Amino acid sequence: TEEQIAEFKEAFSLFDKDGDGTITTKELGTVMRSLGQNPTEAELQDMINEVDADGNGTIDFPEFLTMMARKMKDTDSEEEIREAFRVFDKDGNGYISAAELRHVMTNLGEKLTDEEVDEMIREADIDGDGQVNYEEFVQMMTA
Amino acid sequence: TEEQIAEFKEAFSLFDKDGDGTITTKELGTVMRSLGQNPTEAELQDMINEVDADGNGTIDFPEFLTMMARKMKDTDSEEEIREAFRVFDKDGNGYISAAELRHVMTNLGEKLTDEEVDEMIREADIDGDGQVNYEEFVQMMTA
Amino acid sequence: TEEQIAEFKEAFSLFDKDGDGTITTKELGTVMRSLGQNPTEAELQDMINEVDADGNGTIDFPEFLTMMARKMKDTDSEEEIREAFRVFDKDGNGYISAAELRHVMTNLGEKLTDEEVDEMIREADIDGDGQVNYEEFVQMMTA
Amino acid sequence: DVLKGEKALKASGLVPEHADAFKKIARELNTYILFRPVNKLATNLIKSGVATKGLNVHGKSSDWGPVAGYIPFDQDLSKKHGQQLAVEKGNLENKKSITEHEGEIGKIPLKLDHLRIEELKENGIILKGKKEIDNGKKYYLLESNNQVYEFRISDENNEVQYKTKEGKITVLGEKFNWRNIEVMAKNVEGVLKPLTADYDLFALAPSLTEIKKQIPQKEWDKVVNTPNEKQKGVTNLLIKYGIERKPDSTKGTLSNWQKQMLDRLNEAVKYTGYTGGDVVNHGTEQDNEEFPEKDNEIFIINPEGEFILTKNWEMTGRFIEKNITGKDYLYYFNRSYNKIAPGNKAYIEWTDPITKAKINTIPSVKKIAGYLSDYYNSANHIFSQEKKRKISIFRGIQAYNEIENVLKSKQIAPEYKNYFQYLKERITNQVQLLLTHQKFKLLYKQLNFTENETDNFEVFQKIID
Amino acid sequence: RIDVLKGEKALKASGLVPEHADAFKKIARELNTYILFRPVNKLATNLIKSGVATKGLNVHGKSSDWGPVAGYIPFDQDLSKKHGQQLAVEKGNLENKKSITEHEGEIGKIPLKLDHLRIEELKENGIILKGKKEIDNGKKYYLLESNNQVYEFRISDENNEVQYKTKEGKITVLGEKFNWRNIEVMAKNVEGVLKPLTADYDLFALAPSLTEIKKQIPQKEWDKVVNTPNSLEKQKGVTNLLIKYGIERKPDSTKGTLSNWQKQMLDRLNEAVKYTGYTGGDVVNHGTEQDNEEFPEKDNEIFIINPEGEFILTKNWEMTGRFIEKNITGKDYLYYFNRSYNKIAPGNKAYIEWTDPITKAKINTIPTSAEFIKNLSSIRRSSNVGVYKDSGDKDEFAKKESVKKIAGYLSDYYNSANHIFSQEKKRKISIFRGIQAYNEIENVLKSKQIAPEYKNYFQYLKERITNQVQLLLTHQKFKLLYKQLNFTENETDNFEVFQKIID
Amino acid sequence: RIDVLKGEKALKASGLVPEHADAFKKIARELNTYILFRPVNKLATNLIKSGVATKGLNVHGKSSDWGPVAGYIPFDQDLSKKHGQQLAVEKGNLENKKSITEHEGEIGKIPLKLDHLRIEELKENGIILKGKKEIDNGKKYYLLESNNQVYEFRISDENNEVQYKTKEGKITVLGEKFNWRNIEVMAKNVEGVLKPLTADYDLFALAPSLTEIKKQIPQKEWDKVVNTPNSLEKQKGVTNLLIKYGIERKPDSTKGTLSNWQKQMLDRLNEAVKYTGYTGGDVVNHGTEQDNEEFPEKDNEIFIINPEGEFILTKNWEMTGRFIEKNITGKDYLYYFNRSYNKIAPGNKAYIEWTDPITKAKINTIPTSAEFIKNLSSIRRSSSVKKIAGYLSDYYNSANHIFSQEKKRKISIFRGIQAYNEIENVLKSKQIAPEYKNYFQYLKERITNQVQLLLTHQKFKLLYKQLNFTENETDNFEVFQKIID
Ligand SMILES: Nc1ncnc2c1ncn2[C@@H]1O[C@H](COP(=O)(O)OP(=O)(O)OP(=O)(O)O)C[C@H]1O
Ligand SMILES: Nc1ncnc2c1ncn2[C@@H]1O[C@H](COP(=O)(O)OP(=O)(O)OP(=O)(O)O)C[C@H]1O
Ligand SMILES: Nc1ncnc2c1ncn2[C@@H]1O[C@H](COP(=O)(O)OP(=O)(O)OP(=O)(O)O)C[C@H]1O
Ligand SMILES: [Ca+2]
Ligand SMILES: [Ca+2]
Ligand SMILES: [Ca+2]
Numbered sequence A, B, C: 001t002e003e004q005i006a007e008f009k010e011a012f013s014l015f016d017k018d019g020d021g022t023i024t025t026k027e028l029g030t031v032m033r034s035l036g037q038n039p040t041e042a043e044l045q046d047m048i049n050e051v052d053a054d055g056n057g058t059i060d061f062p063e064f065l066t067m068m069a070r071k072m073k074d075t076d077s078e079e080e081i082r083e084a085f086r087v088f089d090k091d092g093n094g095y096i097s098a099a100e101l102r103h104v105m106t107n108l109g110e111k112l113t114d115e116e117v118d119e120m121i122r123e124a125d126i127d128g129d130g131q132v133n134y135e136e137f138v139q140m141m142t143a
Numbered sequence D: 001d002v003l004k005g006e007k008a009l010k011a012s013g014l015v016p017e018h019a020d021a022f023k024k025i026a027r028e029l030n031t032y033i034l035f036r037p038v039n040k041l042a043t044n045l046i047k048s049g050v051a052t053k054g055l056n057v058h059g060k061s062s063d064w065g066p067v068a069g070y071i072p073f074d075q076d077l078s079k080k081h082g083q084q085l086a087v088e089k090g091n092l093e094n095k096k097s098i099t100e101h102e103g104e105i106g107k108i109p110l111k112l113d114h115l116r117i118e119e120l121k122e123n124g125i126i127l128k129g130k131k132e133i134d135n136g137k138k139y140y141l142l143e144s145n146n147q148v149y150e151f152r153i154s155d156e157n158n159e160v161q162y163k164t165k166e167g168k169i170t171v172l173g174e175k176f177n178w179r180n181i182e183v184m185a186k187n188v189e190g191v192l193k194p195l196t197a198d199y200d201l202f203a204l205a206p207s208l209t210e211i212k213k214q215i216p217q218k219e220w221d222k223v224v225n226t227p228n229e230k231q232k233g234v235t236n237l238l239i240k241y242g243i244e245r246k247p248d249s250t251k252g253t254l255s256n257w258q259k260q261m262l263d264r265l266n267e268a269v270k271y272t273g274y275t276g277g278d279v280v281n282h283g284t285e286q287d288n289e290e291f292p293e294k295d296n297e298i299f300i301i302n303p304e305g306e307f308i309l310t311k312n313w314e315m316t317g318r319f320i321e322k323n324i325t326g327k328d329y330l331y332y333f334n335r336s337y338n339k340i341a342p343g344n345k346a347y348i349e350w351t352d353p354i355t356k357a358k359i360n361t362i363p364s365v366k367k368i369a370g371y372l373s374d375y376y377n378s379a380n381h382i383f384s385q386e387k388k389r390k391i392s393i394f395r396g397i398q399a400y401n402e403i404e405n406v407l408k409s410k411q412i413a414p415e416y417k418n419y420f421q422y423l424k425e426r427i428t429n430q431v432q433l434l435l436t437h438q439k440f441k442l443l444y445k446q447l448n449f450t451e452n453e454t455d456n457f458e459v460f461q462k463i464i465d
Numbered sequence E: 001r002i003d004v005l006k007g008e009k010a011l012k013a014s015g016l017v018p019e020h021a022d023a024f025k026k027i028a029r030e031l032n033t034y035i036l037f038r039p040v041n042k043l044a045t046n047l048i049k050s051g052v053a054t055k056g057l058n059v060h061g062k063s064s065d066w067g068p069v070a071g072y073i074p075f076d077q078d079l080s081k082k083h084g085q086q087l088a089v090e091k092g093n094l095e096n097k098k099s100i101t102e103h104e105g106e107i108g109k110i111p112l113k114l115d116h117l118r119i120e121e122l123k124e125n126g127i128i129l130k131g132k133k134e135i136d137n138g139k140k141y142y143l144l145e146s147n148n149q150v151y152e153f154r155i156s157d158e159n160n161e162v163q164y165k166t167k168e169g170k171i172t173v174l175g176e177k178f179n180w181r182n183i184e185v186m187a188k189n190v191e192g193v194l195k196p197l198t199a200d201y202d203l204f205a206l207a208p209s210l211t212e213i214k215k216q217i218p219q220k221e222w223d224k225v226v227n228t229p230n231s232l233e234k235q236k237g238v239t240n241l242l243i244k245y246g247i248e249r250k251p252d253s254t255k256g257t258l259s260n261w262q263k264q265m266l267d268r269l270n271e272a273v274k275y276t277g278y279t280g281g282d283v284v285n286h287g288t289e290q291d292n293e294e295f296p297e298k299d300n301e302i303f304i305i306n307p308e309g310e311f312i313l314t315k316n317w318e319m320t321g322r323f324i325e326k327n328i329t330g331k332d333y334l335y336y337f338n339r340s341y342n343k344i345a346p347g348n349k350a351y352i353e354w355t356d357p358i359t360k361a362k363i364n365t366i367p368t369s370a371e372f373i374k375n376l377s378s379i380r381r382s383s384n385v386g387v388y389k390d391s392g393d394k395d396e397f398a399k400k401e402s403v404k405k406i407a408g409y410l411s412d413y414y415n416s417a418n419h420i421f422s423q424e425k426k427r428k429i430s431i432f433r434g435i436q437a438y439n440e441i442e443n444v445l446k447s448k449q450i451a452p453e454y455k456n457y458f459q460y461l462k463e464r465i466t467n468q469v470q471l472l473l474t475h476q477k478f479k480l481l482y483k484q485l486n487f488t489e490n491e492t493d494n495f496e497v498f499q500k501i502i503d
Numbered sequence F: 001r002i003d004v005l006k007g008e009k010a011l012k013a014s015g016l017v018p019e020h021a022d023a024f025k026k027i028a029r030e031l032n033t034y035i036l037f038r039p040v041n042k043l044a045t046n047l048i049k050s051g052v053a054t055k056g057l058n059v060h061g062k063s064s065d066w067g068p069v070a071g072y073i074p075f076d077q078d079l080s081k082k083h084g085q086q087l088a089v090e091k092g093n094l095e096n097k098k099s100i101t102e103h104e105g106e107i108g109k110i111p112l113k114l115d116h117l118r119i120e121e122l123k124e125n126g127i128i129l130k131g132k133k134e135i136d137n138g139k140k141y142y143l144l145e146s147n148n149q150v151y152e153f154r155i156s157d158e159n160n161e162v163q164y165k166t167k168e169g170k171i172t173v174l175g176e177k178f179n180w181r182n183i184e185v186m187a188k189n190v191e192g193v194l195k196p197l198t199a200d201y202d203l204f205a206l207a208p209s210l211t212e213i214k215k216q217i218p219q220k221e222w223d224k225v226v227n228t229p230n231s232l233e234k235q236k237g238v239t240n241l242l243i244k245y246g247i248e249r250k251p252d253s254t255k256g257t258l259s260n261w262q263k264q265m266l267d268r269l270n271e272a273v274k275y276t277g278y279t280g281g282d283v284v285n286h287g288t289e290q291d292n293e294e295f296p297e298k299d300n301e302i303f304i305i306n307p308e309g310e311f312i313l314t315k316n317w318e319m320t321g322r323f324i325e326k327n328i329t330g331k332d333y334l335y336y337f338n339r340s341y342n343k344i345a346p347g348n349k350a351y352i353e354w355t356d357p358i359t360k361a362k363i364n365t366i367p368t369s370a371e372f373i374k375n376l377s378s379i380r381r382s383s384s385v386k387k388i389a390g391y392l393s394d395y396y397n398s399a400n401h402i403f404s405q406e407k408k409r410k411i412s413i414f415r416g417i418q419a420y421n422e423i424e425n426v427l428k429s430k431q432i433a434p435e436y437k438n439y440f441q442y443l444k445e446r447i448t449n450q451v452q453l454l455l456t457h458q459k460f461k462l463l464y465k466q467l468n469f470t471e472n473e474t475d476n477f478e479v480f481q482k483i484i485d
């Protein structure tokens, strides 16, 4: 969609003491990081070295907007994930509970102990409220 | 954009002794004064020196377009001008009178002498018809 | 067009076991002609060194489009010819017979003998049915 | 032949108290206040304090049935009942308001209170009566002279529902048993309040005297205090704090001055007891260049606190020229007029002077080059007023046959020719007024053009004498 | 016998002015050409006869066939013959609006005036009835009644301007209601004065005799073509001329898209009615309907004037086609039907069918290396696109048995080099050449049905193939003579088998 | 408890052929999975039973539910149920037009042949009635009556071919007006001959039990996942297995968008009917409605066949929503609702609402980073502190898996107020597009509810005054800890 790019654009307007929008590879991460993406610090090298080897190290927009056109082709499971989250949350309260996690695991053939699922839920819980919400479930699933 | 460009592909041909639409800086100020503009000799090279890092003397259409590009910016405020003219013309005859301009003036807090008014009209007046029409009135702000 | 341009790029991948879609000038004619054309060994060498001069002499899609976007501008006559065929085919069976040819010929002023007429038919006849079908009529009129 | 007093009001839809409160503003600010029609069935709702829809809700209000006065979610219950495509376009707009403005705008079930039913009984809109009993609940069928929809209203909570009479199918291929009439509502402190029709300003006519006030006294003197190029001052000065408009965020395209005028109008209604908040949310129709609305009646409040109602477009135009555009007041009309509006493709005609009197001109082997198309030469400010109309007439006749008598050159089609031929006719009068001011086929023979202008320039200059 | 109207009867249904029709019999007879007209707004005939200007392509507004404005092009298209149709009326008004703006000065709108006579013609035609006297704000009008149920009408006594308004309680398709307002009509700028427009004579088609287009060819190039050796050059040379001066047509600035002889036939027709008195200008403003590929028009009744000067009028599309097939496309006359026929017109998305002899025989016709590789292109639109090689998921394979050999064996069927042989030789070599591309496909249907029904396309080629193969064979003395051939060996071991089987 | 139909009574409302539904029961039981069908043209059921072929996606023409063509897909879309709707009919004809062209040879059109038997069925169905004879051009024709006043139908006696024409006066929706012409029906090619088409059973949904999904997962990928030291990498790899073998859908060339287990389902279903004697090929030709994202259909009566082989038929969209919730969605069964729901469908611009649990909690949870931006982009349709987009990116920091709930809460409550501050100041560029004022003003509430929730979980305007205005320092986080204690 055109919004997709409209979003990535919002990233620049945020942190860009350049004006025209030509942030380098020193803040490239400061973009995708606060914009749902966790690519390896390594892939940031070869990529910003192939499509960006003009000898200036200035990432205008296409060098970004275009380079971006890749990840959202396989891991764009953003939809499926949101779909799966609804599967766990049986009661439909917006959060995935230890209990719910149990049922899904149980029914899939993996029997767990009320101690484990709580280990699993706690490990997935980021804000420490004992339950996993979509955001956290994304974090857990994306990262 | 069309109307936003067709305004050049309709005049960049009546004045050009070259069967390829490629003129020179010679008539550069000739076409412009035919398109509504009225730049001074001074204002010709001073502008074709920056954007035109070539300076070959022979300018075609592609260069002509890119030229008047950002030229019609604030100078394209003709709209408000036209609506301004309709404010003067009280009887909507298509021309502004002395009693009119005077009236408009004597209403904006600037009491003009029954003498100064007739002076103004004649200033922008070109036909001497004791009136000013849009075609003329516009000249007042085009300069 | 979405189809016209989707055929050349389509037949391109019919004999190019190299992946990089780099057909050879030898298999070129077998392509540029395996489709609606029958150019001479000349163009195969006349334009193979013009738009194609990267050393080896391989050909890719963008280059093929360049070539096809050339002598495929006047070949639009396909329409007219088709309509023409319909003219000769009086009985409208889809084939031009040795007796309808005499009509179109004589009526156009060119009076011919059974010997002559029957010869033209056979000339254009390719499968030996004894008449000329559209396909036949097309080649004989273009190739 | 307009309407005035309480009569013009009874047709304006505007709420009297508010209407009344507007006089004060009309006089004080000494400017004309013109409104478009305001849904009549929504006039009482506004009085009861119901909220009015801003530009975030394009939905069509309704003027029939229970939903009367509100913005139905189901547009086929709006003023556009029927009109298959009308209904749809509206619906899509509701959906957009509901989605693109989540939290801001929404839809709630329709609850006609006790008073409202009474009102609609007077307007003969609906008639409450026969009790009903279905899923163990008490409902009263709301009667309406409609043949497509059958309504009813809950007694437990006063909610209104609606279906479709016996096998009676609706416009958009639909049919359905007792549903629920949803209405466009805005978010007010967490709670959703149903919306009604706002007061749309057709235009605002401010006295130039007021437009001056708008101007900063210091900045005006900068060019007004005898700098004498002075006209250009008062104009480019009048343009800003008078003409120039600019797109807003909630009000469409509006002018600074207008925003103020706006607030006054809203504030004015408050003093009346209107809780709903604002009742004038956007710019004037005159700035609605996207989807122009040609309304037959325009409620007008003159600076004298009077009420005037137009009966037809042609009539509104006269009033606007007779009292506004031609009475020292600042006015301008929707730039889309006399053109095909880009949005709804509306061609709304309006008398435009620059055309009314459109009998003038403007944009080896030497004929294409030279002074043969510069009639308008700024260097004419020095040439005596007499030589003006003298050299003028020439400049005109100069173009009489610039490269014009190329008519029968060969086959030159219908406009070009009929135009150069028309253009000719124009120059004719344009030059006529000159001669006629103080003096063509009166004696065009004395005008023989074969030699260069620099030649006859002398001959002609004496011909008129 | 084809149940078509003749003489007077067909003329009356034609809509053309009787005099104009007769005046055309001349051109038909003289230039030995069939003239075909599309219906003409019957309420316009008398306006045309009276010399009312006709509309050209710069005015697409539809004409009215009812009410006081019958025969004219009403600005408010709801008064057009498209009345009621919410969408049509819309496309109508918007079209009328562009005409007033885009071609400003050339096309405008004026108030409708019904003179004393017209009002009479309308009463007889039973269109409107001159009602009673009404006085409104000083002016005096007479009501004009019509069985319409959405509009009320009236005419001024002072200037004869007709007005209309919505009836009480009624609404307009555009959802409007309004009081008395002049009815505006589309006018053209004739000598500075705006004159109302009416319906033109839109030609459905023109079939000139072949001998007639002959005169279109300069007696020189016809020479430089006839006086030559190779008959394959003589016949091919003649054909190409035919196309040049008869078949080819190009888009004009105003006439739309007509040919040259057509532009002449026009000039002719217009001039012919000029003789009769028509003071309105041209009556035929643009090319034939066969060149209206974007917005084709399927008219039930087509008026026809044959070269014998007779009047005909088909009753339905099917009948037109038959008439054209028996008296024109089957009797030495230049003719070509609209190219959008049998296709989906780009503009109006119309799908107008028409008998194409070619197709009728595409059954028993072997495809072309092109009429193949191209079908394998669109059949690729109903599937994604990436790598033709390795069409599946398994990377253990990346080819198909007899892949491209099919196309090759196809063009090998259509080899011009066959002229050096005899019929019998061609037949045999072709029949075999047919079974060649057949087998290569037969095999491709024996590996994996990869794509859903690309197999539907190949079960099709084989369908045609067989027909052709059988065709050529039925000229001497398939599956039966196919099991006698083996294609597991090689080309240099099979051919040496078929050569005998035939005999 | 919800007022819904069941058994025989629900079947008769499904439009499905009895034997076919009876066959579907076995399948639903056999694979403990709810099978939900959308409505089926009732006037097509016999056609189907009869053995008439059904239509795939290559034929978007709507089926007729009236007149002599009732049940078939008329070429002239005005004779279809979409009668009257000038646009639906236009789009219908356009689709029918493309079907004939774009699929030349595979899809065609043919004259309607109403044989002796269909007449009776139509009579009993109260659709048409054979009337007074009438000869024409030496041919026999019996007028077929109908409650339609726009058209009039007739049928031959030699080929039982039906023909129609406009009734004098009346004008076709498209504005046409003609006389006696044949009624053409969409058809497909079968071994060379063109055979008429009727409606196809359209699945509204396929909700299999998680236990049924497992079987989809290869007994290896699952074992690899299950057996993993890390707890998170496991959980994730577990969901992916669910997505990949359960949720994930793909676009097929002729069956629309559907998953692989759904494809199997279709085959099973069609195999089921073919066994009961049906001979028109497949009766189920494409994925479920929950994937018809472009042109969603909100039907009031969904026919359901639960794993027990029972028949149920919801009465209204809300009831359908309840049933899915209390019997499918919150009961160990894989299910996903159309992605276009709660939004404006791209194609038909439909707005079909559905209860999404994730939104219920949107109110209390605070937005992530991408949710902040994806709301500055989509919000920049009706129209410099990136610290907020960062702070939120800190609140949801996947590095907190070492800390404890006691801890997490602490730092989350902080990281949160950090944003509730960097957002409170933004509300201080005097103003800025007031349409942004509410976003934050709403986001603030979204952060309030979140923190004030993490507090009642342990110990908001109060604890805020414990401000750490401090320009740049972690000392802020220090005085913070001190407040709770
Ligand atoms: N100043 C303006 N700038 C831009 N668009 C404007 C302006 N004034 C009006 N419009 C356009 O005209 C539309 C008509 O206004 P709207 O508020 O929808 O109608 P309304 O007058 O309340 O009518 P209903 O009573 O709801 O039928 C809204 C907007 O698209
Ligand atoms: N030869 C042609 N080339 C291109 N377009 C053509 C040609 N003939 C017809 N058309 C197209 O068909 C359109 C139909 O003609 P038009 O003048 O609008 O109708 P008409 O025959 O006057 O019908 P009304 O009586 O006005 O309904 C006009 C033009 O867009
Ligand atoms: N799984 C799917 N993937 C893509 N599109 C789908 C899917 N399911 C349905 N659709 C869309 O919905 C459309 C409605 O199906 P269609 O076959 O036309 O209707 P139907 O259910 O047979 O109704 P009628 O009986 O013809 O009224 C067809 C297709 O564009
Ligand atoms: Ca939960
Ligand atoms: Ca949590
Ligand atoms: Ca004046």
Ligand SMILES: [Ca+2]
Binding pocket: B125, B126, B127, B128, B129, B130, B131, B132, B133, B136
């Ligand atoms: Ca003047």
Ligand SMILES: [Ca+2]
Binding pocket: C088, C089, C090, C091, C092, C093, C094, C095, C096, C097, C100
């Ligand atoms: Ca023949």
Ligand SMILES: [Ca+2]
Binding pocket: C125, C126, C127, C128, C129, C130, C131, C132, C133, C136
């Ligand atoms: Ca042959």
Ligand SMILES: [Yb+3]
Binding pocket: D053, D198, D199, D200, D282
């Ligand atoms: Yb409004």
Ligand SMILES: [Yb+3]
Binding pocket: E055, E200, E201, E202
């Ligand atoms: Yb025409």
Ligand SMILES: [Yb+3]
Binding pocket: F055, F200, F201, F202
């Ligand atoms: Yb279907």
